[PDB]
């Protein structure tokens, strides 16, 4: 129902006025974001302990809380900062340190230091790899006239955004390479649609495909050797795969129907995609070495835009169920579907590399904004807003 109760104490700050960042706020919000933890409200804390020994287990047990996060933040002549946390047991081992660490970071990595604490605590208590130091990429339509579309990247939680690319035409569907160093996207900069790959550090741009008609929807294979995308030069959209070492392209689908929005399975062999071949969009699957695709979505009237988990256990998608469209999960072994979001005009979902969260676009006014839903359905939140309309969120791999 609500996530496992946990106490996050405001981190101890030694110095000038107020701390430069609320490290324990970051740690609380992250843990809340995963759906897994219900951090006790800061106002409701029984004690603001500043280290592992200043923690009173009784106080915490009494509230159903078996772990407390405390930390410290100190400054360094060098303009840098020391950030430390201790995860203390208040359950079976009252007063025991379960995890702890120490960083030296510049002010600009304070959020990062909070996210490292989050990741470490998260993983110790759940045994699941933390995803709080991973980013998202998306397209923003701004109010600027000349370059209204802006391929951007930020931290999964909205902070620290930067611009990768500005365009006078539209940009669509960004995709991360599995090492997180490149993004693939559709650009219309030419007058026509084209698929490029951009190195983030560099800005270097590799041209991938520009055939007649349509070129879109990229997905990098998990092993890093391929790029799947859709092309409609035959007459309808069909799936193609490119060998990145050679530049060589295969046709994966043939079909008078439209086949688009490829997504990989963990084996870099199979893809799930969307096809209208059955009328209203449905999710299908196919091997890149051929064979016929198989439908895999029988729940609801329409299912499109899939994202398969990194372990291949499930998939998220845009689904029309009970007469409307939301983000929903399909257990790939059992077959069950769960509706996750409850906002309006839910599009483009993307999974976090540990499968605990989904980022998606939703409709608000004449504009788009970004939403985050835990994969268990418990936690829903809108991200900080920005200066224009936001579409096409892509969650990065671990970084």
């Amino acid at each position: 129902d609500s996530g496992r109760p946990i106490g996050v104490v405001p981190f101890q700050w030694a110095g000038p006025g107020a701390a430069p960042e609320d490290i324990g706020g970051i740690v609380a919000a992250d843990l809340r974001n995963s759906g897994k933890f219900n951090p006790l409200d800061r106002a409701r804390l029984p004690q603001q302990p500043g280290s592992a020994q200043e923690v009173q287990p009784a106080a915490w047990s009494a509230l159903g809380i078996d772990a407390v996060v405390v930390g410290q933040v100190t400054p360094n002549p060098d303009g840098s900062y020391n950030v430390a946390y201790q995860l203390v047991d208040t359950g079976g081992a009252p007063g025991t340190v379960l995890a702890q660490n120490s960083y030296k970071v510049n002010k600009q990595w304070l959020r990062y230091a909070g996210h490292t604490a989050s990741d470490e605590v998260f993983e110790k208590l759940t045994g699941i790899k933390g995803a709080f130091r991973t980013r998202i990429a998306y397209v923003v339509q701004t109010n600027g006239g000349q370059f209204p579309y802006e391929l951007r990247v930020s931290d999964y939680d909205g902070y620290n955004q930067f611009v990768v690319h500005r365009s006078p035409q539209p940009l669509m569907s960004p995709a991360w390479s599995p090492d997180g160093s490149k993004l693939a996207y559709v650009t219309f900069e030419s007058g026509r649609s084209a698929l490029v790959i951009q190195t983030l550090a560099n800005g270097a741009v590799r041209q991938v495909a520009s055939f007649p008609r349509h070129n879109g929807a990229p997905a990098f294979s998990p092993d890093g050797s391929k790029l799947a995308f859709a092309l409609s030069k035959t007459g309808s959209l069909n799936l193609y795969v490119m060998d990145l070492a050679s530049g060589q392209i295969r046709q994966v689908t043939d079909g008078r129907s439209n086949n688009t929005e490829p997504t990989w399975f963990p084996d870099s062999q199979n893809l799930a995609f969307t096809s209208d071949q059955a009328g209203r969009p449905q999710v299908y699957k196919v091997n890149i070495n051929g064979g016929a695709p198989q439908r895999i979505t029988w729940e609801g009237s329409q299912n499109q835009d899939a994202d398969v988990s990194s372990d291949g256990k499930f998939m998220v998608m845009v689904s029309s169920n009970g007469g409307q469209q939301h983000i929903a999960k399909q257990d790939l072994a059992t077959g069950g579907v769960q509706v996750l979001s409850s906002t309006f005009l839910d599009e483009t979902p993307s999974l976090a590399p540990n499968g605990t969260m989904v980022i998606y676009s939703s409709s608000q006014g004449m504009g788009s904004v970004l939403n985050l839903v835990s994969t268990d359905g418990r936690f829903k939140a809108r991200l900080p807003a920005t200066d224009g309309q936001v579409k096409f969120p892509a969650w990065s791999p671990y970084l």
Binding site: S193, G216, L237, N258, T260, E261, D276, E347, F392
Partner: peptide, 12 residues
């Protein structure tokens, strides 16, 4: 500017 499906993430 789109893929000309009317259904996809990439229509317009």
């Amino acid at each position: 500017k789109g893929d000309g499906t009317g259904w996809s993430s990439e229509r317009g």
